[PDB]
Design a protein around this ligand. Sequence first.
Ligand SMILES: COc1cc(OC2CCN(C)CC2)ccc1Nc1ncc2c(n1)n(C1CCCC1)c(=O)n2C
Length: 254
Amino acid sequence: QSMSVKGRIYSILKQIGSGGSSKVFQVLNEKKQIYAIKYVNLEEADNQTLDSYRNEIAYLNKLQQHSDKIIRLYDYEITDQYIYMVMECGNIDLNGWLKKKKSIDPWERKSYWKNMLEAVHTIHQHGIVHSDLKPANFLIVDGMLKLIDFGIANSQVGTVNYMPPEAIKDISPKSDVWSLGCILYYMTYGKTPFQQIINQISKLHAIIDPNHEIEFPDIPEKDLQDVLKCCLKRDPKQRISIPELLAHPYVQIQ
Ligand SMILES: COc1cc(OC2CCN(C)CC2)ccc1Nc1ncc2c(n1)n(C1CCCC1)c(=O)n2C
């Protein structure tokens, strides 16, 4: 098993993940360094899908310099047939890590929250709203959480547990605040705010219904409780912004 990206030879070790036209592999370069290669098959992609892919690459290549909480893209090879992307290899995705770990450390949680705010803050600064944030979008690379994608290109497929109420009616940087809040709620209470509701139509109804009060059990971290209360406001106008979350005592205290 082997492959070439811009003349540089990579030895395939394992297949990290799979998609529709996409395949992610854990590779090794000529200098025995470990990387992640994303392979995209364009042999079925239409011109709208191709441009969504070119856009996502350009943005990932641009926001590279702006924040270290954005996944490294070292090199890429684009042909009509295929896209090969030499990226940084992570240990695990946040979703996989949270599915494994029974108890999550409060210091780990703060660190992870901080990292998510910086990554999402950086994308917003360039006019990008992910609009679909889930823990699968975040990758752990040495205790550091990194944002995998920006939601531009067409791994927790079809999840409504992190969906904002405004998205269900149909979207601003505030939409990402609701999704991030759901991720933090999961790291706090062990489940997403609407995980108890199995029926998807009933679940969607609950997110958009203000008469359905979101539960906020008492925890030693009062700062943490306020963040969740501030993020999970159904009216985006009544919801806290990313620059404000970065100045919140939970992120800055101590
Ligand atoms: C080998 O290291 C990993 C293991 C891992 O856990 C997998 C969970 C599922 N099983 C079947 C295999 C291990 C998830 C991500 C990584 N690292 C990683 N490092 C870099 C990645 C990247 N993933 N991904 C996808 C996220 C989920 C699947 C692939 C990427 O798109 N890049 C750029």
